[PDB]
Write a protein that binds this ligand. Structure first.
Ligand SMILES: *[C@@H]1O[C@H](CO)[C@@H](O[C@@H]2O[C@H](CO)[C@@H](O)[C@H](O)[C@H]2NC(C)=O)[C@H](O)[C@H]1NC(C)=O
Ligand SMILES: *[C@@H]1O[C@H](CO)[C@@H](O[C@@H]2O[C@H](CO)[C@@H](O)[C@H](O)[C@H]2NC(C)=O)[C@H](O)[C@H]1NC(C)=O
Ligand SMILES: *[C@@H]1O[C@H](CO)[C@@H](O)[C@H](O)[C@H]1NC(C)=O
Ligand SMILES: *[C@@H]1O[C@H](CO)[C@@H](O)[C@H](O)[C@H]1NC(C)=O
Ligand SMILES: *[C@@H]1O[C@H](CO)[C@@H](O)[C@H](O)[C@H]1NC(C)=O
Ligand SMILES: *[C@@H]1O[C@H](CO)[C@@H](O)[C@H](O)[C@H]1NC(C)=O
Ligand SMILES: *[C@@H]1O[C@H](CO)[C@@H](O)[C@H](O)[C@H]1NC(C)=O
Ligand SMILES: *[C@@H]1O[C@H](CO)[C@@H](O)[C@H](O)[C@H]1NC(C)=O
Lengths: 190, 190
């Protein structure tokens, strides 16, 4: 039967990879790989083995080797996970000056991060975390409400994203938005 | 200049891999890879690129692509880390029966684990850890002394090894020795 190596792959957008599709019939009728990716085949001996160079990996895809040993068949997919740190991570624009007392509502907007399963979005207050949830949707958002206090003057919040590719062998990639600086005031005023 | 992909590889003993050695001179004089590993070369187009299949990876090795662009040159090594869970993990044999009072000394002997940098050896008492150090030497050992107590009767210790390949994308591989069961006695006796 058909087999492929590797079976799981973590790679950058655009990145390419080598995939080997091997079988166990000594003289199989057909052997190839089923994918839309720009592929390329190489001079590998003992043709019970074929090596393809997949190319413009822009998306999580699952290439599939297929070896046709008569009626029926058998296959084997490989999991290509494409990774990339969000194109933009910022809080919706807001006026720094805010009235003491309102249940102000912060909203972080994230655009295009992948794999979204390892992407966490986190609203903070300085380096103190407020809300912390996974990135979902596009642009993915996250909200929290701050009851503005006199104490908050000078306080400044930010939104940060965490792309944890550590368990996949890579790193934890983070991105921080520009800081929202809160200026408060009590009334009698302005 | 010369470049290689991947640059770091974690693989099983025996395991093989595909390495690509690419250069940037459009018409370079020489391009190949410097290694003792059984290698094999494939039909890859645009020969500014060569793909080798390294084979009997029994050891941490660092294969090196070299592209000769006139006098001088340039190269690029790839890091092959070969992994394998210890062949044997056991405590030196000891008589279960021990006198209340002695500073009994336990000794766990580990043979052949790799990469030793991620291999931790840990002496335990039931599932309660006693000593916990990295595996060094061959057979690598680890010792601790238990002052035998009347309370210890029925207590049983073991030695366990932890091969943490999680940060490298793999898993944490563990191995537990057979359990040393302590039987104590106070004297007047036997
Ligand atoms: C989010 O953070 C990532 C990682 O810290 C940034 O991406 C890196 O940017 C540097 C400088 O351009 C490059 O040398 C790296 O190759 C990039 N790595 C990746 C995975 O992209 C990224 O620029 C940040 N996002 C934004 C919008 O600035
Ligand atoms: C130490 O633990 C490892 C992992 O739990 C054992 O190795 C696995 O053994 C099973 C059964 O033979 C195989 O299916 C796996 O392919 C093995 N994995 C690896 C990485 O070897 C190993 O047997 C244990 N060591 C000893 C001496 O028993
Ligand atoms: C990382 O991403 C994978 C694949 O998207 C997901 O299943 C896994 O749970 C995530 N792990 C962490 C630690 O984020
Ligand atoms: C804003 O409102 C929520 C809901 O009442 C509350 O839990 C939160 O504490 C308020 N924020 C602050 C900073 O007081
Ligand atoms: C952001 O807000 C925190 C918390 O008030 C503050 O300590 C930090 O210095 C602020 N950052 C900037 C750039 O003002
Ligand atoms: C894993 O092994 C590497 C390479 O041997 C070592 O440098 C690294 O510190 C180890 N990490 C852990 C978490 O054991
Ligand atoms: C055996 O000796 C060491 C050194 O005195 C001591 O620290 C240890 O507590 C003793 N073991 C036990 C179980 O009492
Ligand atoms: C090993 O010793 C522990 C601690 O005394 C005990 O709880 C455990 O059951 C023992 N294991 C066996 C197999 O006897």
């Amino acid at each position: 039967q058909t087999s492929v190596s590797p079976s799981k792959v973590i790679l950058p957008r655009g990145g390419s990879v080598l995939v080997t599709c091997s079988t166990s019939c000594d003289q199989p009728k057909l052997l190839g790989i089923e994918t839309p990716l720009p592929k390329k085949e190489l001079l590998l001996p003992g043709n019970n083995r074929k090596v393809y160079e997949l190319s413009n990996v822009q998306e999580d895809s699952q290439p599939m080797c297929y070896s046709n040993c008569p009626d029926g068949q058998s296959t084997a997919k490989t999991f290509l996970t494409v990774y990339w740190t969000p194109e933009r991570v910022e809080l919706a624009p807001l006026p720094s000056w805010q009235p003491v007392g309102k249940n102000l509502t912060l909203r972080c907007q994230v655009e295009g991060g992948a794999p979204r399963a390892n992407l966490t979005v986190v609203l903070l207050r300085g380096e103190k975390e407020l809300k912390r949830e996974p990135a979902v949707g596009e642009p993915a958002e996250v909200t929290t409400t701050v009851l503005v206090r006199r104490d908050h003057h000078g306080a400044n919040f930010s939104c940060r994203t965490e792309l944890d590719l550590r368990p996949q062998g890579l790193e934890l990639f983070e991105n921080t938005s520009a800081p929202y600086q809160l200026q408060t005031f009590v009334l009698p005023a302005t």
